[PDB]
Design a binder for this molecule. Structure first.
Ligand SMILES: Cc1ccc2ncccc2c1-c1ccc(O)c(C(=O)O)c1
Ligand SMILES: Cc1ccc2ncccc2c1-c1ccc(O)c(C(=O)O)c1
Lengths: 93, 95
């Protein structure tokens, strides 16, 4: 026991070859109550012609973050998606 | 005041993880991303500067010992962390 005293400001989500949207994650018993989580727009990645390359993969980049939960509060560690990256698939065993 | 109790090696914008350690902080250890290249990896496996690797930055909540060195009193603080990298067009679309 111890004592303790959203925005989208980057355009990377649209300029990325693995672009992403944001989804509202809301929990009234949590601080922050509203978290915006990334969801990749495509299964594949966008090529230089602007079309989807289904061979590559858009995958979410996750971060472990601290949140406060009403329980007087209790500290929790959760995983949130912050954006997406484009990867070459695992193609061997 | 309250009381409290490989995929990136495969990315076209790969990154390496770096230890951010602060004993005055909870969590003490945060693993941050540093993009490996300024370009992105092309289909030949080389760095290509027609596109750029950029680090996605996220504002995260953290506990800071207040007063310093205290084992049971903290202040809520927000810091900017690099979580991973994505591959972007070097151009922007707004004025
Ligand atoms: C990321 C992106 C988004 C929208 C596009 N819309 C039309 C055409 C290309 C687009 C690209 C894109 C992808 C890969 C690339 O290599 C390049 C590039 O080389 O500019 C551009
Ligand atoms: C991401 C990645 C990582 C390592 C590689 N090492 C050798 C060759 C290509 C590599 C690729 C890569 C990049 C873009 C791509 O478009 C493709 C692909 O289309 O296969 C593959």
């Amino acid at each position: 026991t111890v004592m303790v005293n959203p925005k989208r400001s980057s355009d990377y989500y649209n300029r990325s070859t693995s672009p992403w949207n944001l989804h509202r994650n809301e929990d009234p018993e949590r601080y922050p109550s509203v978290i915006w989580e990334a969801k990749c727009r495509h299964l594949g990645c966008i090529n230089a012609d602007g079309n989807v390359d289904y061979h590559m993969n858009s995958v979410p980049i996750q971060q472990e973050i601290l949140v406060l939960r009403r329980e007087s509060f209790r500290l929790e560690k959760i995983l949130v998606s912050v954006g997406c990256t484009c990867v070459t698939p695992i193609v061997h065993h």
